[PDB]
Amino acid sequence: MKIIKLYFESPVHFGEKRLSESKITFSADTLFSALMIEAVGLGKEDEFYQLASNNLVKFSDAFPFIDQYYYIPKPMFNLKLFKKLLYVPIDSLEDYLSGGLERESFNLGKLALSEKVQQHDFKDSEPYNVGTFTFKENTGLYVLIEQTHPLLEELLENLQYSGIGGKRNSGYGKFKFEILEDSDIEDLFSAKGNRKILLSGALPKDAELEQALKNASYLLERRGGFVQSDTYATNLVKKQDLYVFKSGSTFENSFDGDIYQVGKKGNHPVYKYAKSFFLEVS
RNA sequence: ACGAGAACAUACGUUCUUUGAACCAAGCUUCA
């Protein structure tokens, strides 16, 4: 298991339904879509989808990190006996679970709002506004992968000089990436456990959804939007809405998701990575 | 096949109008 630490050199915009509103981090849907667009840029989207569908690449949602501290979302535990807390460090999960344990503050950056206009010559200009998020100086995001492949690294390097998120051609989203294989996180992931914490925006297939929802504390998340290409349907069109579990969810039974197809009435398919990525705890 | 594509926070706008560096003031005091 390896890491992809994303040190950002620019404001980002990772909107949820907006241009004016943004979140601090992105998801596996967006990174899979970005890598698929970089694959069709260099003609390897048949290879990349065959790698991703056969579980040769498996990446979680991008998660925050401050100095030598990797963070994950606050796992929804259904324990019996920190509402403003949202991110607990991944190494501190055992003694966060063993008792009511806050050691240091969580600061990643702060949100912003860019004020832009759409200038007209002989007409009054149109204001609009882009909500952004600027990271702090020695912070960023990381993505957990395992058994990395040279195609994944080539596509990541091509995505590095293209932009991640929204409004990327208009000033945002540039970053640099690094692998930096760690030893503590891989030992934390290799250990089994009775309860497993989801880490990507997954959705089980229709023959395992009942098995997945047994002793489950989940949160559904609507993950859709408009199709970003040029060869799809000669006008802007919204893909199929897919409701996946949120990345902080916690399950008893394991599952492997699917790369669902959300675009069918077009010249090329549109995919949505809802494969499952788990972390075992006790 | 990234809640995404496209989109200048842009256009018009004199740091400008008043007002004396004036008023007071033996180159003079003792010298065949």
From TrEMBL:
InterPro entries: Csm4, Csm4_C, RAMP_III_fam. One of its GO terms (molecular function) is RNA binding. Keywords: Antiviral defense, Plasmid, RNA-binding. GO terms for biological process: defense response to virus. Residues 192-281 form the Csm4 C-terminal domain. Belongs to the CRISPR-associated Csm4 family. This is CRISPR system Cms protein Csm4. It comes from Lactococcus lactis subsp. lactis. The lineage of its organism: Bacteria, Bacillati, Bacillota, Bacilli, Lactobacillales. The gene is csm4.
